[PDB]
Amino acid sequence: DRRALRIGVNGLPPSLEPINGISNTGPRIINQIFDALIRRDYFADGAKGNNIKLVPALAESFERIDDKSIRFKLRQGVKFHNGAEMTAEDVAFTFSSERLWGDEAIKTVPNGRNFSPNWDEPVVEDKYTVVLRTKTPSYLIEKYLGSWLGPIVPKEYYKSLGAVAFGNKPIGTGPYKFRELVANDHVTLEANDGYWGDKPTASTITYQVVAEPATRVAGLISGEYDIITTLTPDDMALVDGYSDLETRGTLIENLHMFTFNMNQPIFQNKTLRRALALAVNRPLIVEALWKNKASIPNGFNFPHYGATYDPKRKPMEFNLKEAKRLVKESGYDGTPITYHTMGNYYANAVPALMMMIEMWKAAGITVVPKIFAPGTTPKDSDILIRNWSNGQWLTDGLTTMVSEFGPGRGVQKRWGWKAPAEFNNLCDQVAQLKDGEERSAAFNRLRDIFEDEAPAVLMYQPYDVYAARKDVQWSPVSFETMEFRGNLNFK
Ligand SMILES: CC(C)[C@H](O)[C@@H](O)C(=O)NP(=O)(O)O[C@@H]1C[C@H](O)[C@H](n2cnc3c(NP(=O)(O)O[C@@H]4[C@@H](O)[C@H](O)[C@@H](CO)O[C@H]4O)ncnc32)O1
Numbered sequence: 001d002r003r004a005l006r007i008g009v010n011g012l013p014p015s016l017e018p019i020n021g022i023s024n025t026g027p028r029i030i031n032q033i034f035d036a037l038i039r040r041d042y043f044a045d046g047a048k049g050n051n052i053k054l055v056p057a058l059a060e061s062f063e064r065i066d067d068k069s070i071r072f073k074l075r076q077g078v079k080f081h082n083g084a085e086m087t088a089e090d091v092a093f094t095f096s097s098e099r100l101w102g103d104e105a106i107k108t109v110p111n112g113r114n115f116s117p118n119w120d121e122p123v124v125e126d127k128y129t130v131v132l133r134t135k136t137p138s139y140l141i142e143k144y145l146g147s148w149l150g151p152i153v154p155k156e157y158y159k160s161l162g163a164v165a166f167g168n169k170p171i172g173t174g175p176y177k178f179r180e181l182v183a184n185d186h187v188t189l190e191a192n193d194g195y196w197g198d199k200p201t202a203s204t205i206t207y208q209v210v211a212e213p214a215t216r217v218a219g220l221i222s223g224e225y226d227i228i229t230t231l232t233p234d235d236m237a238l239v240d241g242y243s244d245l246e247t248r249g250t251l252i253e254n255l256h257m258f259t260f261n262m263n264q265p266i267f268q269n270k271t272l273r274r275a276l277a278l279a280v281n282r283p284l285i286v287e288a289l290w291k292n293k294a295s296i297p298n299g300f301n302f303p304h305y306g307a308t309y310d311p312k313r314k315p316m317e318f319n320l321k322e323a324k325r326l327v328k329e330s331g332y333d334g335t336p337i338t339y340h341t342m343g344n345y346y347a348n349a350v351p352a353l354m355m356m357i358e359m360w361k362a363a364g365i366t367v368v369p370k371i372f373a374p375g376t377t378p379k380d381s382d383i384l385i386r387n388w389s390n391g392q393w394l395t396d397g398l399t400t401m402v403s404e405f406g407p408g409r410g411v412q413k414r415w416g417w418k419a420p421a422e423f424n425n426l427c428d429q430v431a432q433l434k435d436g437e438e439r440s441a442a443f444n445r446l447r448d449i450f451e452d453e454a455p456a457v458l459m460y461q462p463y464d465v466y467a468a469r470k471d472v473q474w475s476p477v478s479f480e481t482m483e484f485r486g487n488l489n490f491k
Contacts, residue, residue: 005472006206007482008220018148020167027479028482034170037150040052042477060073061073065131071129072129111410114410115403138432153172174195177191184374186206210228230346231466250464251461253480255392256389256459256460258457261383268418282318282460285460297315299315305396338367338369339369341371388456423446
């Protein structure tokens with residue numbers, strides 16, 4: 001009786017395990033399978049899918065005890081998709097040393113510690129009461145638990161499988177349950193009619209990989225999909241000529257960027273990294289490819305950071321003359337530098353690259369495109385420049401400056417960035433510091449080092465564009481996810 005929803009996607013995540021699936025492609029599936037203790041109510045008070053309001057979800061209520069602990073009273077009678085009841089034991093397990101942040105845990109959940117605050121072990125007080133806490137003060141615990149770090153996993157089932165196998169056969173409490181997957185092809189979910197919240201409106205949801213955006217557009221037109229993802233503003237004219245189809249877009253809390261393998265000699269030092277940054281004329285790219293709908297941040301700095309947004313910070317400059325001076329200072333010898341991109345996995349990746357190649361040529365640098373196919377993982381040692389994105393996943397400036405670029409984390413450890421000591425000291429400091437003038441100035445000091453060092457170059461916040469049949473009522477949200485709770489009606 002309920003319609004089956006068909007979504008043509010840019011790709012599938014490497015896992016459906018909540019943390020290992022953090023990516024542009026995972027939340028749209030993981031949000032359906034799981035619930036967290038707290039949900040972001042994107043559409044509260046008439047907001048156009050960008051409200052930050054956090055409301056109770058698997059937690060019926062909660063109260064902060066002190067600067068490092070929160071007591072959660074859980075909703076009773078919630079079931080996981082395998083029939084097991086959700087209790088404090090599952091919530092404690094979700095945020096335990098064993099699963100998330102301990103030495104052994106991070107062998108199978110590699111960013112469990114990197115992305116977490118300084119957790120202490122959860123304390124189970126009764127079947128429906130758990131205290132979540134940090135070893136040191138943290139004013140962000142609530143925000144973490146309402147984020148993509150927050151999905152609650154089933155303790156016994158997850159332990160029986162381990163994180164890798166669980167990521168191929170996930171069980172949660174959410175409105176849709178996992179049915180099947182074929183790697184790099186599709187994921188099918190089915191309605192969980194035993195859902196504790198509003199009943200699911202779709203009988204099944206299928207996420208089908210269609211890597212090429214032109215093919216994905218053609219598939220919505222030809223009636224193969226109900227919704228398609230990862231389009232650009234210029235794709236609106238291909239869709240909108242048809243009366244029964246439309247585009248739906250919004251600025252999302254994500255940053256497109258490019259970054260460097262700083263283990264490679266040409267990028268061991270900051271000079272050429274910063275020259276490449278200064279040579280990009282972002283306004284021109286945004287005009288040409290984005291209809292002026294993408295937003296160029298004034299540093300690693302967004303309005304949804306709230307108290308750590310600095311509206312007075314100056315934008316990063318486009319300065320060709322200075323880029324040229326830094327190319328000469330760097331001793332650049334004319335070697336062609338590759339830029340790897342997995343096609344248009346990121347919207348406008350290839351057109352933006354081709355515009356940037358011309359800007360880099362104007363600075364005296366030869367950059368060559370290396371477009372690779374889905375499922376052809378380039379070796380780290382073969383990467384010079386690559387594109388990437390970072391979801392700005394708390395309403396706080398700590399992410400992703402600290403969570404990606406901080407001490408011991410991926411950019412420094414895997415990709416070789418030799419950050420100044422003071423950068424790493426500031427990263428550690430801001431995690432214990434309450435919002436206020438001092439925290440805002442510390443983030444500006446981090447941003448200054450980040451700009452000087454250029455371990456990555458921020459391009460813009462994309463204007464995310466989906467296309468859909470008008471007979472499917474669904475609004476996008478300002479994040480790299482799809483929300484169907486209270487937001488998916490057919491006809
Ligand atoms: C599991 C392994 C055993 C296996 O060998 C293989 O899967 C593998 O090679 N894994 P490896 O780690 O080497 O990941 C490879 C190496 C390379 O960095 C690439 N990559 C990483 N992030 C990706 C990205 N993120 P995204 O832009 O969609 O999502 C970002 C996310 O990366 C980021 O953490 C988050 C918060 O900043 O924001 C998201 O938007 N989008 C497309 N490609 C991505 O895949």
